[model samples]
Target chain A: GESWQKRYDSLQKIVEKQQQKMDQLRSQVQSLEQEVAQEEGTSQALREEAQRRDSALQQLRTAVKELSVQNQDLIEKNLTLQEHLRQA
Target chain B: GESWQKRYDSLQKIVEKQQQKMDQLRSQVQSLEQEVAQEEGTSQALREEAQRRDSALQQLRTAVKELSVQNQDLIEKNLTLQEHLRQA
Candidate 1:
């Protein structure tokens, strides 16, 4: 009877330890999920910000090109007038 | 002797089941940890990319502002020249 009791106690101890480890694993999983959720939110924001930046850059480049063309036209016209004056 | 053999057999079965569970839990823990590691690597990459995008946007904004200013100056110069031409 004593030997049986000792074996039963040992089994109980083993079971408790396993349960403890299982609980620890569960909590770790929960924390990791929370961290992932938070990261995803930030990731979404970063992507949106990057998109806005791309759109702004695109518009800016077009505007700059238009200005460059206008400047070239003005410079060319001014040079033509100078040539005319020199010839006259 | 017969009763002792039966008791030992029962304990042996219980131990086997517990071992099985422990092994299963161990594997699950390993996979979870790996998942978290992969997520972390992705997260790091995302943050770095986002930083680069922000920097590019800032530089483009500054360049756009400069172009805008130059365009305004050219427009004003053109207007003055037009007035001079009308008088001529």
Candidate 2:
């Protein structure tokens, strides 16, 4: 009877330790899950910002191209007019 | 004696279940950690891309401004030359 009681006590201690370990693991899982969610949100925001910047950059590039064309036309006209004034 | 044995058996079963739960929780934590790491890497790449696009956009804007100034100067000079030619 004494031996069985001792065995029961030992097993109870083991079960308690196991319960504590399980609780710790559960907490860890919860914390990691939250971290993942937060990171995901951050990533989503970054993606949107990147896309916005990309579109802005594209528009700026188009504007630059148009401005370049206009400048080229003006330069040619200015040269022709200068030549005409010099000849006359 | 029999009651003690039954109690021990029940405790053993609980410990086994606890151990299984801990293992599952540990796996979940590992998976979530991996996901977080991957997301962080992606965010880093996106950040770098954003910076690159921003720099390029800034350069393009500067180019546009320079071109606009040049065009304005040329237009003014062209008008002056045209007027001079007409007067002559």
Candidate 3:
């Protein structure tokens, strides 16, 4: 009877040890999954912000082009008026 | 003697089953670690690209501002000359 009790105790100890390890592994898996989800959310936000900046940059380029043309027209008009004034 | 042998066999089977579970958990942990590392690398590259685009956008904004000022100056000069020509 004593021998059988000893064998039963040994098996119980093994089961408990394995249970602890499995619990730890489960916790780790959950933590990693949360981290991956958070990173994905941040990446998405960054992409959207980048797109807005791109649109703003394009509009600025167009503004620069239009202003350059206006300046060129004014320069030509000023030169013509100056010549006419000199003749007068 | 027979009871001892039967108890030994039962203990051995339990140990083997637990070992298998532990091995599976180890493999899963390794896979998740690799995924996290890959995500981090991608995030770093995206951040660098965003920084470059931000710098380009700032430069474009400055160019637009400069062009606008030049256009305004030219407009003023043209108006002055036209007024003088009218008087003449």
Who wins the TM-score comparison?
2
RMSD of each: 3.6, 2.2, 2.9
Error of 2 at B31 (Å): 1.7
Compose the digit string of candidate 1's lDDT tens values, residues A8-55. 667767767877876777777677777767766766777787788778
* Residue A50 CA displacement from its true place in model 1, Å: 3.1
Q: Best candidate, lDDT-wise?
A: 2
Give per-residue CA lDDT, model 3, range B4-44, as digits (tens). Answer: 65876787788789889988987898888887777776677
lDDT of 2 at B83: 89
Q: Compute the DockQ of candidate 2.
A: 0.72
Q: Rank order by lDDT, top first? A: 2, 3, 1
**Model 1 misplacement above 4 A:** A37-41, A77-88, B1-9, B85-88
Instruction: Score each candidate by Cα lDDT.
Output: 0.71, 0.85, 0.83
Instruction: Give the docking tier of candidate 1.
Output: acceptable
Please count the clashing residue pairs in each candidate, in the order shown: 0, 0, 0
TM-score of chain A considered alone, across all candidate predictions: 0.84, 0.89, 0.82
The residue pairs in collision within model 3 are none
Q: How well is candidate 1 docked (DockQ)?
A: 0.32
Interface RMSD of each: 3.3, 1.6, 2.2
